[PDB]
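Illustration 12: TRAP dicarboxylate transporter, DctP subunit.
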Amino acid sequence: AESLNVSTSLSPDDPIYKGLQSFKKGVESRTNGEVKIKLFSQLGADNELLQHAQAGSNVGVVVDGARLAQFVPEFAIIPAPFVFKDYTTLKKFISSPVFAQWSEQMSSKSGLTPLSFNWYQGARMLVTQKPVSKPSDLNGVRVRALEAPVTIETIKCMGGSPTPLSWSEIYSSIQTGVVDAAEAQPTAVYGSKLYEITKHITKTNHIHLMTGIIVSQKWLSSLTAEQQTILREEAQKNGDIASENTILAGDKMLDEMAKKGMTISEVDTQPFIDGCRYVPEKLGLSEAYKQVNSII
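Figure caption equivalent — predicted structure in token form:
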């Protein structure tokens, strides 16, 4: 018998979690139970789990490019601002040979491998008290940030002032005037109940959130060829399902907030794009950015 333990951080009602459930169902069905998938809320922080996975653990985690940059630094471009014009363009890049090269490098040099990297978690948008049609509308606006260079530079390049604080504290920070605004994907805006205390969502879609199920190469290679391909086939197939469900949920959450008094607006992104073109270079990610652009 064999098994994979997936450490998760999402609510069981999230599309990504239900996708992991579909993934479990697929794998266990096709192997008649010889490979079992366990989903945990318990196992440890992502960074310590990844070290264990390097050593051969049968533990997995759903993580993004920023977390994998420590193994292959190119990965850090995926969450950078205004790299991908839309979701399908993002998919085109993830499926390309350049990305395949980065994954091969992680597998062969760092002993970690994505079963797939198409678990989409949304597009980040602006949540504000006032309308935003152009970057100068954010001058003087304090936007919640995070102690990471990409996030900080994203807020700056878009025109706001980055104000780091824990996401678990975003509602009280807005309510008490520590910060004016936030920057996040719809399920998080909705999940934190921000529609209670803000008035505008602007669809800048400035960052795309792409993740995958990352596992030990040593563990995966210890399984049979048939078990390996089932795992990889099912991860990709179910990542696509979860992705569509994320988008579906996102749209409906936005609709629900508009019906709770919020205004949701599209925006001409071109000025934001031009204002953020320096970011990859400032962050030292030019090589990665140039390889992405060779594709898209």
